[PDB]
């Protein structure tokens, strides 16, 4: 989006050598870089949020709804691993 990227090296010694050996030195496609430090739940409808917003009427329309006639992780507290953090 912005013409930016970030790299994290496993060690700072790598990062420091990368910094000094690359400091504003040219790369062809980059012309010259600048370097600087630093699921839906089955069968549950999802309510459409109205656009641009982010009490009741005292007469309500009642819709003519009539009944119908493995599972896995959906939420983070269901995940046994994320429950450890």
């Amino acid at each position: 989006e912005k013409g930016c990227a970030f790299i994290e090296f496993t060690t700072r010694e790598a990062a420091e050598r990368a910094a000094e050996r690359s400091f504003n030195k040219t790369f062809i496609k980059g012309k010259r870089l600048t370097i600087r430090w630093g699921t839906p739940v089955p069968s549950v409808p999802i309510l459409p949020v109205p656009d641009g917003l982010a009490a009741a009427p005292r007469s309500l329309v009642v819709p003519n709804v009539r009944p119908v006639k493995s599972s896995s992780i959906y939420y983070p507290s269901q995940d046994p691993t994320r429950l450890g953090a």
């Binding site: 309510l47 009427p57 309500l60 329309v61 709804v65 599972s71 939420y75 269901q78 429950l83 953090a85």
Partner: protein
């Protein structure tokens, strides 16, 4: 892993103990074991969240994670090891200094910078067991397979070290807005001298104290463990001077009523009930079965509160007694309280028409000894509590009262109530680590009250200056309270006595009528009461004494404030306030354990304990507040112990299975004394919820009924809008083929109930229920996380719906309430810990206006212990019957079928979530338009301010 099958070599907290050293020693052992287990669970949790791993080209361990409770330490060293004192074996002190980078989170930063004296931190040395290309941790695996904790040492914390190495005192936080530079901080620590000795005397070279790499801080509700243990050890070493009237019932010997005022000789037959009674009619009502009569010279047209009551059956004479052919007799004298000010002062007074069972508790709370009052949910236990405080405060103003409470939340509610009573704002003191966040608009902390005294001292001295001007007195009699005191005794008092002489020595045989309007000296002081004197010497002499007590009260107040001119250090001002100025001191039971050693050193003295929520406080933490003062002689000086609580609600949250279930540490002292059949009053008129809702739990209590207004108020007469029945047990069938689910041991969930609760809460919101009035509860900690996650996805993202008032477990919602509760009974295979009737009574008693218990009927309907509640649930449908055309609020009565349309019956979570989708969608414009209108006027009406 204790199942209840085996014997264990543990002590037990049964009803009775052999001796006081037996009692203390069992508490020490079991609390030491439990608190050690709690430390384990916290440290294992934190060390997973810090995610340690070994650096892939070095020996050293580095932390890939982060946790609110811990920071890695940049350096640590022991800076002092003072030689043992005479007659002492361990070093006198062992002081660490630790350096931590606080990191760049402002919320986390405030917590580390508020580590106070006697906070407990663990210095931890740890390594990863696992070296891998990335690493993950699972609570399903044993912690010792993943992380090695090669050492832990606890320490007390002394304060933050400043710019260069001075200890910041507690008062710096109010003035240190010139913040310490940078993100590094240093803290000074006190190591345990006994473990230091043990570490050295065993020989060391790979010395432990170099190895630490984390410091882990516990939360304030568990920091007290070392102070609890320290207290009990001292009482075992010294003479634990429990009151002679009290040690028997703590051990459970003698008659259980040996501490009750019916048996104690020190009970007083004459009691000034103050504003306890609103009217003389209320006195008659408050004592059924007693003859109530006015004393001679009073008439029922004129008998108005206050009243003294004399209970003749507490007198030792025969001449007035329960004599044959006559009832027990109460003599009522109305009291003319001689007012102390000529201004239009409106006295703050009680406005609660206490029921007879509340008055019986108030009466017992004014008498010395042990008073237990069982307070079922919604029965006014807070107002009984405050009335005992206020009556004691007025009947015996030299006495001091210590208030103990399980939670800061209830301690807040109590102080809001007391401030509506006639208690003087300077006599109240509140203490805690909550004092940085008090929600009351008046600050009752040590800092708050010191500033109040300093503020009021100035405005009183302005009245002294104004009074000196009225007396035409010259020279600065208002530089100081001390100057004002000499000015009062020499000048104000002299002139007043010279006025009383001119009245009395002349007298009405040669005083001119209305001359008191002329010879009264302070007329210029009251220059903004017009028509102060009427021109009648009999009345003007009375209002003159009213004016005098107004002036006299000012210099009385000043003479108490003189100490704030001599004591100029901020600390000493709080120590004077804590030991001399305050008469009502309020403190959580947790904080009472921490502050004991300070309070004993300060010579803190108190005469009455009032406890609320006493059934939730541990046996140990209930006992410690008895001993926050030295005995002044061979015996204690405590006069009253009032315990207010309810043993039919949840116990203290002991969480190790064995220490909970085998050693019975889950028994609070309130519950223990009730099992000993100590006399206890039970408040028996609920007022907070529908009679229909109340019926779900008042079967547990003996005679718990409803206040008269529970039948009368429109909110209890009218139905819940859009529900055909004010409560239901809704039988939730399996959702996506799963009933309950269990992603960890003893961590239960049920997505079908969680999705139904979300649609049901959303249904209420489409009906126009306020989100503040609905709270979602569940019995298990697991589902409470899932309900949060469901709502954080499906509600919180939509501003029309919004988040409920609170999503919680039942156990955390103990003592809270809301109008509407959706309760998820997670279990589907076998009945849970909800089989404990104390879980059930709490769970069912949280709603005021509607309770909708989601659950599986077949798991619960067959249980014996739940049957008294389930026979009420069973009389209403298992399917939720809804009236989608009734917007909130409805005018329909709770018991009548609606005529505006036909109800529909929600089959399951699928039908509910499919209905609510169409119901939301179909009403969405009309609901949106109301929000667009409401959000405009909300911002616009404040936009001019």
């Amino acid at each position: 892993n204790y199942t209840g099958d085996g014997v264990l070599a543990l002590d037990k907290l049964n009803l009775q103990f052999l001796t006081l050293h037996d009692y203390l020693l069992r508490n020490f052992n079991l609390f030491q074991l439990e608190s050690t287990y709690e430390i384990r669970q916290d440290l294992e949790d934190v060390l997973f969240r810090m995610k340690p791993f070994q650096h892939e080209s070095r020996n050293e361990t580095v932390f890939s994670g982060w946790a609110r409770m811990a920071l890695q330490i940049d350096h640590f060293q022991i800076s002092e090891v003072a030689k043992p004192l005479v007659g002492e074996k361990s070093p006198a002190v062992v002081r660490g200094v630790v350096t931590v980078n606080i990191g760049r989170r402002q919320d986390i930063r405030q917590e580390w910078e508020n580590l106070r004296k006697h906070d407990v931190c663990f210095l931890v040395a740890c390594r990863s067991r696992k070296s891998a290309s990335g690493l993950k941790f699972d609570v399903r695996r044993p912690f010792s397979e993943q992380i090695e904790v090669l050492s832990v040492r606890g320490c007390d914390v002394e304060g933050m070290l400043d710019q260069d190495g001075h200890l910041l005192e507690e008062f710096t936080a109010w003035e240190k807005k010139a913040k310490i530079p940078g993100d590094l901080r240093k803290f000074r620590l006190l190591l345990d001298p006994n473990q230091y000795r043990i570490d050295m005397e065993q020989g060391t070279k790979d010395d432990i104290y170099d190895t630490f790499n984390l410091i882990v801080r516990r939360d304030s509700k568990t920091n007290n463990f070392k102070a609890v243990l320290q207290t009990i050890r001292d009482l075992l070493n010294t003479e634990c001077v429990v009151p002679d009237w009290l040690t028997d019932v703590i051990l459970g010997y003698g008659e259980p009523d040996s501490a009750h005022y019916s048996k104690l000789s020190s009970a007083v037959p004459e009691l000034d009930f103050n504003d306890t009674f609103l009217s003389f009619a209320h006195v008659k009502e408050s004592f059924p079965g007693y003859k109530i009569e006015l004393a001679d010279g009073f008439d029922e047209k004129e008998a108005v509160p206050p009243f003294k009551l004399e209970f003749k059956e507490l007198e030792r004479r025969q001449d007035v007694e329960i004599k044959p052919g006559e009832l027990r007799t109460i003599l009522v004298t109305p009291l003319t309280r001689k007012k102390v000010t000529p201004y239009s002062y409106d006295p703050r007074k009680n406005q609660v028409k206490f029921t007879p069972s509340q008055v019986e508790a108030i009466k017992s709370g004014m008498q010395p000894g042990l008073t237990m009052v069982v307070g079922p949910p919604g029965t006014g236990k807070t107002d009984v509590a405050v009335q005992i405080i206020s009556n004691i405060y007025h009947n015996w103003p030299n006495q001091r009262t210590l208030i103990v409470t399980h939670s800061n939340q209830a301690l807040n509610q109590l102080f809001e109530k007391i401030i509506a009573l006639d208690v003087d704002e300077r006599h109240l003191l509140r203490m805690g680590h909550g004092e940085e966040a008090l929600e009351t608009e008046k600050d009752f902390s040590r800092y708050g009250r010191v500033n109040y005294v300093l503020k009021e001292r100035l405005q009183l001295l302005n009245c002294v200056e104004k009074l000196a001007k009225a007396l035409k007195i010259v020279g600065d009699v208002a530089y100081t309270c001390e100057n004002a005191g000499y000015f009062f005794r020499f000048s104000v008092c002299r002139v007043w006595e010279e006025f009383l002489a001119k009245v009395t020595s002349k007298g009405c045989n040669k005083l001119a009528e209305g001359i008191i309007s002329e010879i009264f000296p302070f007329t210029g002081f009251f220059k903004d009461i017009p028509d102060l004197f009427s021109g009648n010497n009999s009345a003007d002499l009375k209002v003159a004494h009213s004016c005098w007590r107004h002036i006299e009260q000012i210099f009385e107040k000043l003479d108490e404030f003189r100490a704030f001119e001599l004591l100029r250090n901020g600390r000493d001002r709080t120590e004077y306030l804590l030991v001399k100025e305050a008469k009502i001191i309020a403190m959580t039971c947790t904080h009472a354990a921490l502050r004991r050693n300070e309070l004993v050193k300060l010579g803190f003295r108190y005469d009455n304990i009032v406890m609320e929520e006493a059934a939730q406080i541990l046996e140990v933490e209930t006992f410690i507040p008895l001993l926050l003062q030295n005995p002044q002689d061979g015996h204690n000086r405590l006069k009253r112990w009032i315990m207010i609580g309810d043993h039919h609600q949840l116990p203290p949250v002991v969480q190790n299975q064995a220490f909970q279930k085998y050693s019975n540490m889950e028994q609070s002292l309130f519950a223990r004394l009730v099992r000993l059949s100590v006399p206890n009053v039970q408040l028996d008129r609920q007022g907070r919820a529908r009679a229909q809702i109340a019926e779900l739990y008042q079967w547990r209590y003996n005679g718990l009924g409803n206040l008269p207004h529970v039948d009368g108020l429109p909110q209890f007469q009218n139905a819940n809008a859009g529900f055909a029945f004010p409560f239901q047990f809704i039988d939730i069938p399996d959702f996506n083929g799963h009933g309950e689910t269990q992603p960890s041991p003893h961590f239960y969930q049920n997505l079908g109930e969680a999705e139904y609760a979300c649609a049901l809460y959303t249904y209420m919101r489409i009906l126009g229920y306020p989100a503040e009035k609905i709270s979602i509860l569940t019995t298990y900690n697991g589902q409470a996380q899932l309900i949060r996650d469901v709502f954080q996805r499906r509600c919180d993202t939509n501003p029309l719906i919004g988040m409920p008032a609170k999503v919680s477990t039942v156990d955390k919602y103990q003592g809270q309430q809301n109008d509407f509760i959706i309760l998820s009974l997670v279990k589907t295979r076998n009945i849970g810990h909800i089989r404990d009737v104390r879980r059930l009574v709490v769970a069912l008693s949280r709603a005021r206006l509607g309770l909708y218990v989601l659950g599986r009927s077949k798991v619960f309907m067959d249980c014996l212990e739940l049957t008294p509640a389930m026979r009420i649930f069973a009389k209403y449908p298992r399917k939720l019957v809804i009236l989608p055309f009734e917007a909130h609020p409805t005018i329909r009565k709770w018991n009548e079928r609606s005529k505006d349309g036909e109800p529909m019956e929600i089959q399951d979570t699928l039908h509910m979530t499919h209905f609510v989708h169409e119901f939301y969608m179909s009403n969405l414009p009309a609901m949106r338009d109301a929000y667009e209108q409401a959000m405009n006027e909300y911002m616009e009406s404040q936009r001019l301010l």
